Design an enzyme around this catalytic site. Structure first.
Site, short mmCIF file in Angstrom:
data_model
loop_
_atom_site.label_atom_id
_atom_site.label_comp_id
_atom_site.label_asym_id
_atom_site.label_seq_id
_atom_site.Cartn_x
_atom_site.Cartn_y
_atom_site.Cartn_z
CE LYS A 38 -1.98 -1.25 3.99
NZ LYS A 38 -1.41 -2.82 4.32
CG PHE A 51 15.55 -5.45 6.47
CD1 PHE A 51 16.53 -6.19 6.42
CD2 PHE A 51 15.58 -4.73 8.05
CE1 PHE A 51 17.31 -6.64 7.59
CE2 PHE A 51 16.22 -4.97 8.62
CZ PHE A 51 17.10 -6.06 8.72
CG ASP A 99 7.42 -11.41 9.99
OD1 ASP A 99 6.28 -11.68 9.45
OD2 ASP A 99 7.63 -11.05 11.28
CG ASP A 119 6.18 -14.97 11.67
OD1 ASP A 119 6.69 -15.10 12.38
OD2 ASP A 119 5.64 -13.46 11.26
NE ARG A 158 4.75 -10.16 3.90
CZ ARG A 158 4.27 -9.97 5.07
NH1 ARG A 158 3.44 -8.84 5.04
NH2 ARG A 158 4.63 -10.44 5.88
CG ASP A 180 6.12 -11.86 16.89
OD1 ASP A 180 5.08 -11.42 16.61
OD2 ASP A 180 6.51 -13.11 16.48
CE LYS A 199 3.78 -7.84 16.16
NZ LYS A 199 3.49 -9.19 15.74
CG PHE A 216 -1.42 -0.48 11.08
CD1 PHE A 216 -0.28 -1.52 10.72
CD2 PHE A 216 -2.14 -0.21 10.28
CE1 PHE A 216 -0.08 -1.84 9.47
CE2 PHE A 216 -1.74 -0.56 8.77
CZ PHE A 216 -0.87 -1.41 8.50
CG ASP A 226 -1.00 -7.62 10.66
OD1 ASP A 226 -1.00 -7.65 9.55
OD2 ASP A 226 -0.30 -8.61 11.54
CG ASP A 227 -2.27 -9.36 15.79
OD1 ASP A 227 -1.30 -9.54 15.05
OD2 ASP A 227 -2.12 -8.93 16.98
#
Ligand SMILES: O=P(O)(O)C(O)(Cn1ccnc1)P(=O)(O)O
Ligand SMILES: O=P(O)(O)C(O)(Cn1ccnc1)P(=O)(O)O
Ligand SMILES: [Mg+2]
Ligand SMILES: [Mg+2]
Ligand SMILES: [Mg+2]
Ligand SMILES: [Mg+2]
Ligand SMILES: [Mg+2]
Ligand SMILES: [Mg+2]
Lengths: 343, 343
Positions: free
Chosen positions: B50, B91, B96, B100, B105, B167, B193, B232, B236-237
């Site tokens: 975005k 980056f 990430d 994860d 993505r 995290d 994070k 935010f 996101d979660d």
């Protein structure tokens, strides 16, 4: 010698490095567990090596700065920046061991192979990098060389990362291509992936701390140091196969990992047609039978003798370069480092 | 709106960013293949999102710098630093997604899941980071805010890396512990994070570029921005589970990855004793049957309705904070960003 007499002092300073790194944040109790992980990451990955790079910052500083200007604060900053180079090392090694699928490092299991760690080590590495700049801000924020050091550490990282990219591009897993393993490509790889951060960086840092920021002087020092770094990497490739993991502290992976090692490039230059096919059929594979085959061929081509010969010729060339380019810096600066990596 | 009207201009500038990054080194033909890999890494990982973070640097710059001081060079630097924030994003996201074990993505396969890439993506990520500082040196080396920006990008990285460490520590694979999933721990995780680099960093960068370096002003802006960042991340979660991967561009992994997500913390606060056991038995496992079980319980506790309610209450609180802390900065600065992440 000068490195040896400084080693203990250098190492003992590591406790303070850890303290200042695990204190300036503990005023934020919320990240306490993270800070505790950071300490754990630092102790495991910054300790256990030869400290030649960090010690170089210290040794070079003492030989370049007039003793009347070597106050207690001044020395403290020197071994702090020395530890910064050591953390840059740790940062690259943690990532490198993952990307090379290595087993041991410095005589213990690679951090990422420690049960409980795995790919979290990627973030751990990134933290080690971040710590360089925390320490620079903490101890050198007010020095006139502060921005020069910051840019020097960043530039050196970019270069070694460019070099890693070359290292990895030239070594696709499952993709054997002896064709790409040339002298030119090798020299370019090791220049970027090892020579800048391991040899130019430490000496250049001490030069900036001693107020020596002159472009020509840095270029002249760089001329000597990159060539030493090439030698050092070639020596590293030799040890990967022909070194005792009891002394190196690491298990070799170059043949399995399909790497553009100095050995394979030299093998290719001496390879009869039939031998070439033996190399092409057994290189870059995990099978212990095939790796042993490659090593047997290296020994059939007396590559161990070729390395011993290269090392002497190279050492003489480094010395020649020191005679040419050391001035106006003390020659002991480069001689000391050269003595430390000879054989 | 102001973001939308700027988007196209921002994106078109990406070609130049790539050109200057893949040119200043091409004078070294030896690293040419590395540079070519860098271009490939940049196009794949910096494009497709975005651009809210990069656009924020640009929007905020225009609203904070007097139009008489917005020359062509001045604007160029602004969208360049905007792209630097975008590269910091790239980056962290590349690393990430590996840590994860994510699949997609931005609506395409994660870089590390691309055949041919794998764990080499670790070095690719490190290159994306290095590029931030290449661009800063290239376009801002002479500006009075040059050192302020460098330290701001480094500090923000350390913070987000501290946050990642939290995290990951709170989410051991194979180690279920609902006990550690508290409100306090959650707030601390997301603060470090996400909140610093995604919300404080962009606005703070534009403030330094506009000559606004005052400590109190930055703290006041930080007060607003961290709270927006918390919102935010919580959003996101929520999207990780209850969002359509066709719009988010990514497949959720939080339940499988045993994460301290906002959903599980809210679930634990509303969980009857029996429900707690259902959570404890099915959370943090790869089995699709058990993940579905967790989601069913979230929906049984109307967590989707609880999120809708939190979002409104939170938005009102952010607005209150803007009324309190925006001055002397234009309120449109924060309103514009807030409007962009509302729902
Ligand atoms: O052989 P590599 O370059 O991978 C090595 O020398 C590490 N390295 C990475 C960059 N420079 C050096 P190591 O043998 O220690 O695994
Ligand atoms: O949920 P995560 O924090 O991993 C995430 O939001 C990325 N991230 C990482 C740090 N901050 C944010 P993503 O859902 O995009 O995978
Ligand atoms: Mg290696
Ligand atoms: Mg390597
Ligand atoms: Mg090696
Ligand atoms: Mg993720
Ligand atoms: Mg994550
Ligand atoms: Mg997420």
């Amino acid at each position: 010698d000068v490195y040896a007499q400084e080693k203990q002092d250098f190492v003992q300073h590591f406790s303070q490095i850890v303290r200042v790194l695990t204190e300036d944040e503990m005023g934020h109790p919320e990240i306490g567990d993270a800070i505790a992980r950071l300490k754990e990451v630092l102790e495991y990955n910054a300790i256990g090596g030869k400290y030649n790079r960090g010690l170089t910052v210290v040794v070079a500083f003492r030989e370049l700065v007039e003793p009347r200007k070597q106050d207690a604060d001044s020395l403290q900053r020197a071994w702090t920046v020395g530890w910064c180079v050591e953390l840059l090392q740790a940062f690259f090694l943690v990532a490198d061991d993952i990307m090379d699928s290595s087993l041991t490092r410095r005589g213990q299991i690679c951090w990422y192979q420690k049960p409980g760690v795995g790919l979290d080590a990627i973030n751990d590495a990134n933290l080690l990098e971040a710590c360089i700049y925390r320490l620079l801000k903490l101890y050198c924020r007010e020095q006139p060389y502060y921005l020069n050091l910051i840019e020097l550490f960043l530039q050196s990282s970019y270069q070694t990362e460019i070099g890693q990219t070359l290292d990895l591009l030239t070594a696709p897993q499952g993709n054997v291509d002896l064709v790409r393993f040339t002298e030119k490509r090798y020299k370019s790889i090791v220049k970027y992936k090892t020579a800048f951060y391991s040899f130019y960086l430490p000496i250049a840092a001490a030069m900036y701390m001693a107020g020596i920021d002159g472009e020509k002087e840095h270029a002249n020092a760089k001329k000597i140091l990159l060539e030493m770094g090439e030698f050092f990497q070639i020596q590293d490739d030799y040890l990967d196969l022909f070194g005792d993991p009891s002394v190196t502290g690491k298990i070799g992976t170059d043949i399995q990992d399909n790497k553009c090692s100095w050995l394979v490039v030299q093998c290719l230059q001496r390879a009869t047609p039939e031998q070439y096919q033996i190399l092409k059929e057994n290189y870059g594979q995990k099978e212990a039978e095939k790796v042993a085959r490659v090593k047997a061929l290296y020994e059939e081509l007396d590559l161990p003798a070729v390395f011993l010969q290269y090392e002497e010729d190279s050492y003489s060339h480094i010395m020649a370069l020191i005679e040419q380019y050391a001035a106006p810096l003390p020659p002991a600066v480069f001689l000391g480092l050269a003595r430390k990596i000879y054989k």
